[PDB]
């Protein structure tokens, strides 16, 4: 379950920090991952349209924080940093050091400073299954020969032929008496069959 994914852009040098139990600058001040962070991580390049005219300052990051980030914590906070004992009243004095200095996405550098179309697949588990899963390739059918079959949960082996028995909009199963499964309307053609 929990296919919460994020769609954002990350500079090329800070890429590996999206990792289970990693530190750095993003993983210290911008985006924290917990221990045992399994799943997947994927990034690829978003070079040549992530450069607005002379300095891509639409896109920010927090450069300073008092203490450690909690995992899964979004730092939307206008609470700027304080270094010394004199608190900042908005006027940039000597110990403010405004943490939201922005991304330097000006790709005139090498490959290490490039904007990348990154995603962070964050996977965890709660109590409700049958979430996002995979389309398991949906093979063909066969008739009039004994054959193994696996259907959507139930399975068996036999020959598949036509039928006279009828269904309703809800059935996925069929047995004549005493758990002897014999009837499947197929999940693709929606056509009723027998299992001899």
């Amino acid at each position: 379950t929990n296919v919460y994914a994020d769609s954002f852009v990350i500079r090329g040098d800070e890429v590996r920090q999206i990792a289970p139990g990693q530190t750095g600058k993003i993983a210290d001040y911008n985006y924290k991952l917990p221990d045992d962070f399994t799943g997947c991580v994927i990034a690829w390049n978003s070079n040549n349209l992530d450069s607005k005219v002379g300095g891509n300052y639409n896109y920010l990051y927090r450069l300073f924080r008092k203490s450690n980030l909690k995992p899964f914590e979004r730092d939307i906070s206008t609470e700027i940093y304080q270094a010394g004992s004199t608190p900042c009243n908005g006027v940039e004095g000597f110990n403010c050091y405004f943490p939201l200095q922005s991304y330097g996405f000006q790709p005139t550098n090498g490959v290490g400073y490039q904007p990348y179309r990154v995603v962070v697949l964050s996977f965890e588990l709660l109590h409700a299954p049958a979430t996002v899963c995979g389309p398991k390739k949906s093979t063909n059918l066969v008739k009039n020969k004994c054959v193994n079959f696996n259907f959507n949960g139930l399975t068996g082996t036999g020959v598949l032929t036509e039928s006279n028995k009828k269904f309703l909009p809800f059935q996925q199963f069929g047995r004549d008496i005493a758990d002897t499964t014999d009837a499947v309307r197929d999940p693709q053609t929606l056509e009723i069959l027998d299992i001899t």
Partner: antibody, heavy 123, light 109 residues
Framework: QVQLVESGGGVVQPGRSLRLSCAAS????????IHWVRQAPGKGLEWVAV????????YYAESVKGRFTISRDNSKNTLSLQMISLRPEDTAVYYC????????????????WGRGTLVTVSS | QSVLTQPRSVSGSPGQSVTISCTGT?????????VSWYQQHPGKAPKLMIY???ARPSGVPDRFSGSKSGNTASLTISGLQAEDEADYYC????????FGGGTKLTVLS
């Protein structure tokens, strides 16, 4: 339609000044750099200038510095090119050169062109 | 250096392939990978055909192709059509935009 329409061309005398411009439509002009690339009639291509949205970063060519001044207005999606101390080698068809949105092409390359206007510095 | 070295004209039979050099310097061509190719019809604006020597933008046919080794780019147009007959320009950006000398492709008819 992504579209760039030059303005400010004409026929001027050497020693005088002129101001060109270019209006943008069809694309968010505040997110991509526009340039000036000049071409004399029947000759090669020659870049002039570039302006940033904050108005701080501007780069000029070697035959450009000290005379030509580019600026832009992100709100009106137009720009300006203030030009003083005009010489007859500056006689060229002037193109406001930017990039459209649909391309992966960045702003330092040259995809979205203008139709051009003629500036003649002659006595 | 100041102007990128190109052949002044390249003559080719229609349907064939031509190779047009863009000779620059190490501070112009071999420094980065940012070399362009520009087709300019007479009486019209230029038009982009090649970025980053390997690949092509949208709308550009696959007849346009490039190759770069060292300090010389090489635009290769296979299958010459009569609509390719125009002026050709290569440009590089390491710190500044340096254009080429100009190349008039002549489609022999």
């Amino acid at each position: 339609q992504v579209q760039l329409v030059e303005s400010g061309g004409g026929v001027v005398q050497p020693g005088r000044s002129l101001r060109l411009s270019c209006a943008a439509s069809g694309f968010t002009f505040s997110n991509y750099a526009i340039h000036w690339v000049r071409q004399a009639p029947g000759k090669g291509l020659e870049w002039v200038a570039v302006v940033s949205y904050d108005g701080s970063n501007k780069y000029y060519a070697e035959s450009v510095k000290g005379r030509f001044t580019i600026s832009r207005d992100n709100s009106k999606n137009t720009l300006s090119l203030q030009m003083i101390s005009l010489r007859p080698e500056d006689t060229a068809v002037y193109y406001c050169a930017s990039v459209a949105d649909t391309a992966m092409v960045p702003e330092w390359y040259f995809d979205l062109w203008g139709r051009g206007t003629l500036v003649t510095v002659s006595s | 250096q100041s102007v990128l070295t190109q052949p002044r004209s390249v003559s080719g039979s229609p349907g064939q392939s031509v190779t047009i050099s863009c000779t620059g310097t190490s501070s112009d061509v071999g420094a980065y990978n940012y070399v362009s190719w520009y087709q300019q019809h007479p009486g019209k604006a230029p038009k982009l055909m090649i970025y980053d020597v390997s690949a092509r933008p949208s709308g550009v046919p696959d007849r346009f192709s490039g190759s770069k080794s060292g300090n010389t780019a090489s635009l290769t147009i296979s299958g010459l059509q009569a609509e390719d007959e125009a002026d050709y320009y290569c440009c590089s950006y390491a710190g500044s935009w340096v254009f080429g000398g100009g190349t008039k492709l002549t489609v022999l008819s």
